[PDB]
């Protein structure tokens, strides 16, 4: 029941046909992303992986707004879309929290993985990174987060 339809898979509920054209359009953008473009550069190669983290994030904001913001789908369709692995359950669970409404991924708040026990730089608000920049006179030595290619996922931002 995660991804391919088997006999143990339950039939889809009512509102799935109206959301299915957008979910098919995310699905074919991942297939172009999965394939290897033969890239010599190390900086181009993780740039391809950032497209996968973004395409994953956007399809989960799609199902999140349909149920928690617009209420356009029944809960029986939402429980089906979680079990059939359309929407990332643990990512939606942070989006419900306060301060985490626009979080890019779960790997960027995971403190144990960092050298310093900190969050990712993409979690720091753009007002604050501009401030110590004014101390130095140099703008920003930060463009994209190494694990996501996130330009800053903070709430105020």
């Amino acid at each position: 029941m995660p991804r391919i339809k088997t006999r143990r898979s339950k039939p889809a509920p009512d509102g799935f046909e109206k959301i299915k054209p957008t979910l098919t359009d995310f699905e074919i953008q991942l297939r172009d992303a999965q394939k290897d473009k033969s890239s010599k550069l190390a900086a181009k190669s993780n740039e391809q992986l950032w497209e996968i983290m973004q395409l994953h994030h956007q399809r989960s904001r799609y199902i999140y707004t349909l149920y928690y913001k617009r209420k356009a789908i029944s809960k029986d369709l939402y429980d089906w879309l979680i079990k059939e692995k359309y929407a990332d359950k643990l990512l939606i669970a942070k989006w419900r929290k306060t301060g985490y409404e626009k979080l890019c991924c779960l790997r960027c708040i995971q403190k144990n993985e960092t050298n310093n026990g900190s969050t990712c730089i993409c979690r720091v608000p753009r007002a604050q990174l501009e401030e110590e920049a004014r101390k130095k006179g140099t703008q920003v030595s930060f463009h994209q987060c190494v694990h996501c290619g996130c330009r800053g996922c903070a709430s105020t931002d």
């Binding site: 010599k40 550069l41 900086a43 181009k44 140099t138 703008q139 030595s141």
Partner: protein
């Protein structure tokens, strides 16, 4: 400034135009650990570069400029960089402003950021030494660069002078016909390091030089380091410039004692 400070740096080579990481065909089977061809004999596998640096056309501002990067793109020196304005290294020729920021680091590194070594090499190849500041570049392979046509030794000297002139302050050039060797000395170490990468495995012949269609078949002009100068006029001149730069830091080594008191 007119070339560099106003522009953004352009893309010399597209990523689909970048050459294959596999070398051509040397032996029978390709080794996938060392990335070489095995089981046979190699056939003098050097080749000329299909690309080159265009100082005024390709220089411009980069993302290394906005971040405070000290070092220069080595693929920009080769004429190969595919990032353009996205690249984290500087796309312009080293100058007296940036070389002043390469002061503590340049003792052990080069202008591209590569560590130097104690011994030189048996053939005076790629990177320099942290024992000797060598500002002179040897030029060889001039027969292979000109694609085996003949020229007079006075005219060879000028064709070396022009292409090396753009790459920085050229101290002196003295082409030798007895040994087909160019000894090109610069003002700075950082411009010798830039020019060594930039004109290595290139062609000397100009687009009007009647062999511009056929120039890729060559080997290019070798650019290694230059040994000590054996004629005694320059050795006394070496002794002179050793003494006068010594006294310059005889001044400052009693100023920081004067600060100490």
């Amino acid at each position: 400034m007119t070339s560099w400070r106003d522009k953004s740096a352009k893309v010399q080579v597209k990523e689909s135009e970048l050459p294959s990481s596999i070398p051509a065909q040397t032996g029978l089977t390709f080794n996938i650990w060392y990335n070489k061809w095995s089981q046979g004999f190699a056939g003098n596998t050097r080749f000329v570069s299909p690309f080159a640096l265009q100082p005024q056309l390709h220089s411009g501002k980069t993302r290394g400029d906005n971040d405070g990067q000290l070092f220069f793109c080595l693929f920009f020196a080769k004429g190969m960089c595919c990032l353009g304005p996205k690249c984290e290294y500087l796309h312009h020729i080293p100058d007296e402003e940036d070389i002043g920021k390469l002061a503590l680091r340049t003792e052990v590194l080069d202008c591209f950021g590569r560590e130097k070594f104690a011994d030189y090499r048996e053939d005076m190849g790629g990177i320099g030494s942290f024992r000797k500041k060598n500002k002179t570049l040897y030029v060889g392979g001039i027969d292979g660069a000109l694609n085996s046509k003949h020229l007079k030794p006075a005219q060879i000297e000028s064709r070396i002078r022009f292409v090396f002139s753009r790459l920085g302050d050229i101290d002196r050039i003295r082409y030798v016909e007895s040994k087909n060797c160019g000894f090109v000395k610069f003002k700075y170490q950082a411009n010798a390091e830039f020019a060594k990468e930039a004109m290595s495995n290139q062609t000397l012949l100009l687009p009007s030089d009647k062999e511009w269609d056929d120039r890729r078949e060559g080997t290019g002009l070798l650019v290694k380091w230059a040994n000590e100068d054996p004629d005694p006029a320059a050795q006394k001149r070496l002794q002179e410039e050793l003494k006068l730069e010594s006294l310059n830091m005889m001044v400052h080594l009693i100023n920081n004692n004067t600060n100490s008191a």
